């Protein structure tokens, strides 16, 4: 089943997500609470027709964090596979340093080549580079369906 809501006041503009997903602007988001490596997480998002989350704006991040638990860490679709700080998003969209939300002092390791979002005291939610093989929860994102 799909969950559909109206965009603006236009009674014909209904956009939808599968029911276990949440919606914000033109995208659907799914929180995957199983612990898996970054690559297995991206594969899992791919199976449900999506990708690991790509964060475009502060507004988007502020929405996503409403659906996360402050004691948990979640993979983003953000990685540096060659260890050169040449960050990649999984949907081949640009990496814009001035719209990133790294915690203070992050990213801090060339050998930590995947990114997570989590909560740190006082700094609240932000990003950390970590080892890709360490199992974590993840966030998947895809476009809404219009009917
Ligand atoms: C707890 O946070 C610290 O350790 C992790 C790895 O566990 C690093 O990614 C992070 O930058 C800090 O140095
Ligand atoms: Ca780090």
Numbering used by the authors: 67 to 213
Authors' account:
Blood dendritic cell antigen 2 (BDCA-2; also designated CLEC4C or CD303) is uniquely expressed on plasmacytoid dendritic cells. Sequence analysis reveals that BDCA-2 also contains a C-type CRD, despite the fact that it falls into a structurally distinct group of type 2 transmembrane receptors. Stimulation of BDCA-2 with antibodies initiates anti-inflammatory pathways through association with Syk kinase and adapter proteins such as Btk and BLNK, leading to stimulation of phospholipase C and a reduction in secretion of type 1 interferon. Binding, structural, and mutational analysis of the receptor suggest that it has a primary binding site for mannose, but that selectivity for galactose-terminated glycans is achieved through a secondary binding site.
